Scaffold this motif. Structure first.
Motif, PDB file in Angstrom:
ATOM      1  N   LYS A  47       1.138  -0.982  -0.161  1.00 26.96           N
ATOM      2  CA  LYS A  47      -0.132   0.014   0.514  1.00 26.96           C
ATOM      3  C   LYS A  47       1.173   1.386  -0.183  1.00 26.96           C
ATOM      4  O   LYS A  47       2.088   1.398   0.394  1.00 26.96           O
ATOM      5  CB  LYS A  47      -0.789   0.418   1.452  1.00 26.96           C
ATOM      6  CG  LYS A  47      -1.262  -1.312   1.491  1.00 26.96           C
ATOM      7  CD  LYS A  47      -2.051  -1.063   3.276  1.00 26.96           C
ATOM      8  CE  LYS A  47      -2.644  -2.894   3.743  1.00 26.96           C
ATOM      9  NZ  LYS A  47      -1.428  -3.873   3.411  1.00 26.96           N
ATOM     10  N   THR A  79      -2.952   8.902   5.543  1.00 23.70           N
ATOM     11  CA  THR A  79      -3.642   8.682   4.201  1.00 23.70           C
ATOM     12  C   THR A  79      -2.612   7.014   3.789  1.00 23.70           C
ATOM     13  O   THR A  79      -1.956   7.793   2.999  1.00 23.70           O
ATOM     14  CB  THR A  79      -4.099   9.602   3.629  1.00 23.70           C
ATOM     15  OG1 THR A  79      -4.385  10.647   4.211  1.00 23.70           O
ATOM     16  CG2 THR A  79      -4.980   8.694   3.205  1.00 23.70           C
ATOM     17  N   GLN A  80      -4.360   6.631   2.949  1.00 18.68           N
ATOM     18  CA  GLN A  80      -3.489   5.564   2.125  1.00 18.68           C
ATOM     19  C   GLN A  80      -3.942   5.756   1.209  1.00 18.68           C
ATOM     20  O   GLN A  80      -5.263   5.873   1.102  1.00 18.68           O
ATOM     21  CB  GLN A  80      -4.532   4.223   2.711  1.00 18.68           C
ATOM     22  CG  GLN A  80      -3.907   2.937   1.389  1.00 18.68           C
ATOM     23  CD  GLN A  80      -4.975   1.649   2.124  1.00 18.68           C
ATOM     24  OE1 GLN A  80      -4.988   1.190   3.022  1.00 18.68           O
ATOM     25  NE2 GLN A  80      -5.790   1.046   0.783  1.00 18.68           N
ATOM     26  N   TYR A  82      -3.093   4.788  -2.491  1.00 17.35           N
ATOM     27  CA  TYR A  82      -2.709   3.273  -2.761  1.00 17.35           C
ATOM     28  C   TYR A  82      -3.133   2.085  -1.749  1.00 17.35           C
ATOM     29  O   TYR A  82      -2.421   1.524  -1.354  1.00 17.35           O
ATOM     30  CB  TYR A  82      -2.204   3.396  -4.172  1.00 17.35           C
ATOM     31  CG  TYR A  82      -2.415   2.169  -4.558  1.00 17.35           C
ATOM     32  CD1 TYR A  82      -3.868   2.028  -6.279  1.00 17.35           C
ATOM     33  CD2 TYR A  82      -1.642   1.429  -4.495  1.00 17.35           C
ATOM     34  CE1 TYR A  82      -3.151   0.982  -6.680  1.00 17.35           C
ATOM     35  CE2 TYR A  82      -1.983  -0.097  -5.387  1.00 17.35           C
ATOM     36  CZ  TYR A  82      -2.465  -0.138  -6.611  1.00 17.35           C
ATOM     37  OH  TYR A  82      -2.761  -1.391  -7.088  1.00 17.35           O
ATOM     38  N   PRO A  83      -4.643   1.621  -2.317  1.00 14.56           N
ATOM     39  CA  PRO A  83      -5.367   1.213  -3.512  1.00 14.56           C
ATOM     40  C   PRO A  83      -5.761   2.924  -3.202  1.00 14.56           C
ATOM     41  O   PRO A  83      -7.005   2.510  -1.687  1.00 14.56           O
ATOM     42  CB  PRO A  83      -5.415  -0.528  -3.471  1.00 14.56           C
ATOM     43  CG  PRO A  83      -5.015  -0.601  -3.061  1.00 14.56           C
ATOM     44  CD  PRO A  83      -3.477  -0.085  -1.635  1.00 14.56           C
ATOM     45  N   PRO A  84      -6.653   3.018  -3.251  1.00 16.34           N
ATOM     46  CA  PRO A  84      -7.759   4.139  -3.391  1.00 16.34           C
ATOM     47  C   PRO A  84      -9.123   3.381  -2.669  1.00 16.34           C
ATOM     48  O   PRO A  84      -9.494   2.024  -2.601  1.00 16.34           O
ATOM     49  CB  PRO A  84      -7.840   4.446  -4.617  1.00 16.34           C
ATOM     50  CG  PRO A  84      -6.545   4.887  -5.215  1.00 16.34           C
ATOM     51  CD  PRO A  84      -6.681   3.139  -4.881  1.00 16.34           C
ATOM     52  N   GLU A  85      -9.710   4.417  -2.498  1.00 18.58           N
ATOM     53  CA  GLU A  85     -11.842   3.898  -1.669  1.00 18.58           C
ATOM     54  C   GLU A  85     -12.352   4.637  -2.089  1.00 18.58           C
ATOM     55  O   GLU A  85     -13.386   4.909  -3.421  1.00 18.58           O
ATOM     56  CB  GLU A  85     -11.337   3.511  -1.000  1.00 18.58           C
ATOM     57  CG  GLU A  85     -11.970   1.799   0.176  1.00 18.58           C
ATOM     58  CD  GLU A  85     -13.166   2.361   1.129  1.00 18.58           C
ATOM     59  OE1 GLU A  85     -14.332   2.587   0.383  1.00 18.58           O
ATOM     60  OE2 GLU A  85     -12.870   1.543   2.099  1.00 18.58           O
ATOM     61  N   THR A  86     -12.595   5.530  -0.843  1.00 19.54           N
ATOM     62  CA  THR A  86     -13.735   6.982  -0.786  1.00 19.54           C
ATOM     63  C   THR A  86     -13.585   7.636  -2.491  1.00 19.54           C
ATOM     64  O   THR A  86     -12.752   8.944  -2.190  1.00 19.54           O
ATOM     65  CB  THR A  86     -14.185   6.889   0.072  1.00 19.54           C
ATOM     66  OG1 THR A  86     -14.337   6.923   1.102  1.00 19.54           O
ATOM     67  CG2 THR A  86     -14.809   8.189  -0.099  1.00 19.54           C
ATOM     68  N   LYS A  87     -14.383   7.914  -3.103  1.00 22.25           N
ATOM     69  CA  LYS A  87     -13.522   8.235  -4.832  1.00 22.25           C
ATOM     70  C   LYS A  87     -14.567   9.992  -4.128  1.00 22.25           C
ATOM     71  O   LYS A  87     -16.194   9.971  -4.149  1.00 22.25           O
ATOM     72  CB  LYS A  87     -14.760   7.772  -5.939  1.00 22.25           C
ATOM     73  CG  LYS A  87     -14.650   8.895  -7.148  1.00 22.25           C
ATOM     74  CD  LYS A  87     -15.205   8.442  -8.194  1.00 22.25           C
ATOM     75  CE  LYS A  87     -14.875   6.564  -8.368  1.00 22.25           C
ATOM     76  NZ  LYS A  87     -15.874   5.515  -7.469  1.00 22.25           N
ATOM     77  N   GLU A  88     -13.258  10.907  -3.692  1.00 22.56           N
ATOM     78  CA  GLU A  88     -14.314  11.942  -3.908  1.00 22.56           C
ATOM     79  C   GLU A  88     -13.383  13.378  -4.052  1.00 22.56           C
ATOM     80  O   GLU A  88     -12.477  13.344  -5.562  1.00 22.56           O
ATOM     81  CB  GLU A  88     -13.680  12.405  -2.347  1.00 22.56           C
ATOM     82  CG  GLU A  88     -15.390  11.982  -1.753  1.00 22.56           C
ATOM     83  CD  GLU A  88     -15.504  12.419   0.111  1.00 22.56           C
ATOM     84  OE1 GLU A  88     -15.026  13.288   0.605  1.00 22.56           O
ATOM     85  OE2 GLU A  88     -15.426  11.013   0.357  1.00 22.56           O
ATOM     86  N   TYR A 106      -2.272   9.040  -8.289  1.00 22.71           N
ATOM     87  CA  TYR A 106      -3.619   8.950  -6.627  1.00 22.71           C
ATOM     88  C   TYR A 106      -3.476  10.052  -6.160  1.00 22.71           C
ATOM     89  O   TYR A 106      -2.448  10.236  -5.741  1.00 22.71           O
ATOM     90  CB  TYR A 106      -3.704   7.073  -6.027  1.00 22.71           C
ATOM     91  CG  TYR A 106      -3.253   5.992  -7.353  1.00 22.71           C
ATOM     92  CD1 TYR A 106      -2.442   5.562  -8.109  1.00 22.71           C
ATOM     93  CD2 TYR A 106      -4.890   5.718  -7.438  1.00 22.71           C
ATOM     94  CE1 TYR A 106      -2.708   4.767  -8.356  1.00 22.71           C
ATOM     95  CE2 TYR A 106      -5.115   4.568  -8.154  1.00 22.71           C
ATOM     96  CZ  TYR A 106      -3.323   3.820  -8.978  1.00 22.71           C
ATOM     97  OH  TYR A 106      -3.716   2.548 -10.167  1.00 22.71           O
ATOM     98  N   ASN A 146       2.150  -1.583   6.240  1.00 18.42           N
ATOM     99  CA  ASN A 146       0.846  -0.227   7.412  1.00 18.42           C
ATOM    100  C   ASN A 146       1.947   0.418   7.764  1.00 18.42           C
ATOM    101  O   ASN A 146       3.130   0.632   7.769  1.00 18.42           O
ATOM    102  CB  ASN A 146       0.231  -1.761   8.164  1.00 18.42           C
ATOM    103  CG  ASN A 146       0.939  -2.271   9.077  1.00 18.42           C
ATOM    104  OD1 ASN A 146       2.477  -1.514   9.663  1.00 18.42           O
ATOM    105  ND2 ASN A 146       1.479  -3.518   9.417  1.00 18.42           N
TER     106      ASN A 146
END
Length: 363
Positions: A47, A79-80, A82-88, A106, A146
């Protein structure tokens, strides 16, 4: 638009930002938005994180010595990416960076909270007792399992941005920065009055100091000196104190016996005009061209001042050299002076992508 980038050691990861400096208004702070470019093949199942840390450091000469040191994270965001999640809501510049860098870019965005200290760096000088210290804002991007993993420099990039201070557009109701005092010389008054025309001044801007002198004594003021003084208080680890002149306008002006003088001095405090930069609170490294004097530290009631690490404030002082009878060899003169607080803040931001390396240029 111009953007800045930095690539990690093994070149398997780089980071991009739209600017090097971010303004702290008071009610809010400018976002630290950007993107990271990744290497999918290299980043096999790992990540990518991006962190922003506000840290206070004390000790460690120039770059690295051995002696004493203290370090404290006063604030950190991670903040993580990549990989992304919440598309904002991507910001306009982020939109472009991605249209340019490609699909392996990203986004990440940091919205710092308010009340955090601004960038302040100080390096000890020949007439100081303390050690190097400062409040930093570092942005790191790295590859890992992590945030718990120890971070290795080979696959991570570190960036130091500045958070500069601006004085609220939501400010007014200014009282009046003026002062008048009396000094007795052989039982006769020497009134010295000084005043500022504004509430807040900005770096690179002229400061007009009004001076009224009512000398009812039989002595003579041979010199009038105007200085802008910087007071720096380290309030965390070691209670170091620095009081330095960052501007001095020595003039000819004299005030004979039973005489008065009304005049306006105009001076502009500037790190550039200072030969000796050691002992001064700056907003960045000495060797850097874009570095300025640190801004006045906004201090609020109810808060522990220690969470700020370093307190910076300014004063305008008016010094009169008074001779025991301003004449001949009676150079057995005295000095009288008054002072006034001075709030010095950053000017303020105003309303094809050219990629530049982040490293600040040395003048």
């Amino acid at each position: 638009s111009k953007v800045y980038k930095k690539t990690c050691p093994n070149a398997k990861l780089s980071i991009y930002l739209g600017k090097r400096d971010f303004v702290d208004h008071v009610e809010h702070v400018e976002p630290v938005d950007g993107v990271v470019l990744i290497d999918p093949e290299y980043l096999k199942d790992r990540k990518v994180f991006v962190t922003l840390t506000c840290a206070f450091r004390y000790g460690r000469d120039d770059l690295d010595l051995i002696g004493m040191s203290f370090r404290k994270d006063l604030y950190s965001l991670a903040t993580q990416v990549y990989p992304p999640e919440t598309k904002e809501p991507l910001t306009p510049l982020q939109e472009k960076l991605m249209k340019k860098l490609g699909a392996h870019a990203y986004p990440f965005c940091f919205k710092m909270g308010t009340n955090l200290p601004c960038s302040v760096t100080l390096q000890p000088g020949p007439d100081d007792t303390g050690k190097s210290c400062g409040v930093d804002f570092e942005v790191k991007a790295f590859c890992a399992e992590n945030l718990e993993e120890k971070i290795h420099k080979r696959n991570s990039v570190q960036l130091v941005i500045r958070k500069v201070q601006f004085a609220p557009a939501n400010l007014g109701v200014a009282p009046k920065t003026e002062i008048t005092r009396q000094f007795m010389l052989s039982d006769r008054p020497l009134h010295l009055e000084a005043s500022l025309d504004k509430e807040i001044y900005y770096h690179g801007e002229p400061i007009n100091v009004n001076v009224k002198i009512n000398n009812t004594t039989g002595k003579i003021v041979k010199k009038i000196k105007i200085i802008v003084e910087q007071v720096t208080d380290v309030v965390l680890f070691s209670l170091d104190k620095y009081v330095k002149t960052v501007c001095a306008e020595e003039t000819n002006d004299t005030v004979a016996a039973n005489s008065t003088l009304s005049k306006t001095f105009s001076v502009t405090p500037m790190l550039a005009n200072n030969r000796e930069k050691r002992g001064l609170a700056l907003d960045g490294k000495l060797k850097h061209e874009d570095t300025n004097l640190a801004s006045t530290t906004v201090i609020r009631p109810g808060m522990d001042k220690e969470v700020l690490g370093i307190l910076v404030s300014y004063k305008v002082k008016v010094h009169l050299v008074v001779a025991r009878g301003g004449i001949l060899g009676d150079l057995t003169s005295s000095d009288v002076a008054v002072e006034l607080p001075l709030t010095l803040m950053h000017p303020k931001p105003s309303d094809d992508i050219i990629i530049e390396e982040f490293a600040r240029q040395k003048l």
